[PDB]
Amino acid sequence: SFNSRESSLADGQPVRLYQFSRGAIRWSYNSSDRDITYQNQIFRTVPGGITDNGIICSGDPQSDQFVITAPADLDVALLYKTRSPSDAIDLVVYDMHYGDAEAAVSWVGQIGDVDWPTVDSCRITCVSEDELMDQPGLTDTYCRTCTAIVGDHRCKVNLVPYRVTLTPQSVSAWVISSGVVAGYADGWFTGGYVEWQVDGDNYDRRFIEQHAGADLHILGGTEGIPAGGQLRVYPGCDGLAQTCDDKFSNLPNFRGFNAMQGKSPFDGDQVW
Template sequence: MSFDSREFSLDDGAPYRNYQFARGVMRWLYTSSDRDRAVGTQIFRTVRGGIADDGIRQTGEASVELLKITAPADLEVASLFRGVPPSSEIALTIFDRHEGESEQVVSWVGSIQSVSWPKRDQAQLVCQPLSARMTMQGLRQGWEPPCPHALYSVWCGVNRDLYRISALIQGITGAAIINGAFAG
């Protein structure tokens, strides 16, 4: 049988999920199955206490599509968020698979947004989908064409003291400050 025929079957399906967390070259592999699962050269480990999610939603709205994963409090990838969270994101890919099938399907891709510990023995990982990045701002340095840096900032390189004027204010009209030295 194929993945699709098992997936749409009324009684032949035996689904489980494989969770792959990645940060650079580091990988954490877990399965919702009752025993460790080998996929190629990778081994997805069973988690004592189980690992599960609240279901994948595809609404087109990134804030609604947050995925919550429940796992034991001592899960290695969750432990990275104790104290200060990691400086780089931890990606998550979820694979759906059926018992006895060699085929697995990518069902969700995203990253960990936050981790909390609602119970002493439980961690909750809140993950945002890859589509959430579409709503993020793009380039932020765009205030002027020849130079993307703020005037007089460390990266700008213009010396503020060379353009400083010491003068007394001779008059104020609305938002304008008047002094003859400013004309120079």
């Protein structure tokens, strides 16, 4: 009846539904003045209303953004206030008419940017998957180092055995200290990242600038790190062939070119 209602000249009762999902956690909002139950999901009513600006599909990712307006107290947007969540918040938009149990999917995407122009409002800019095609695609260089992030699909190195679970001893503005890591050689954890559970099955990740003794340096500060929460810390690969094989014994998968050639052409001037 959704299509029939759209074609109807007197039963038009538009209502737009938004679904923000991050793994196992979902946030449901509706633009009407009362909650709507759809597919066993109830959508909350935001005091003040939630509205968008329209959907544009012109083939230009930079121009085809989707804008959401909502109060500054919106739960899903509140997360971005202090620090952007590590994972992207997928957004799905449905369209349905009051009194009908059928809805149609209109827009699908993820959060691109969030800002709070006024205390009584917040503007969210949503981007589609098409915008991820503007970055280069070379991803190849003939250099000495590995040119591969430890654990990627190219290194084929399993980090689960190297996982270390610990409770930090003391947390400071920029340094998190723990005695368990003090037993490892300096720089063992350099290049690794720290992941811990925020809510449900979602974890927030932070990279490590440097590891020295019992003190760990966290890039961008330690804000948001629970002082007593359980933390998982993985090591980091420098990328050198000696580092790759002595520590991880992954030399066969070494993607770097240590000593094949640095400059030698076959159309130079004098070989000697």
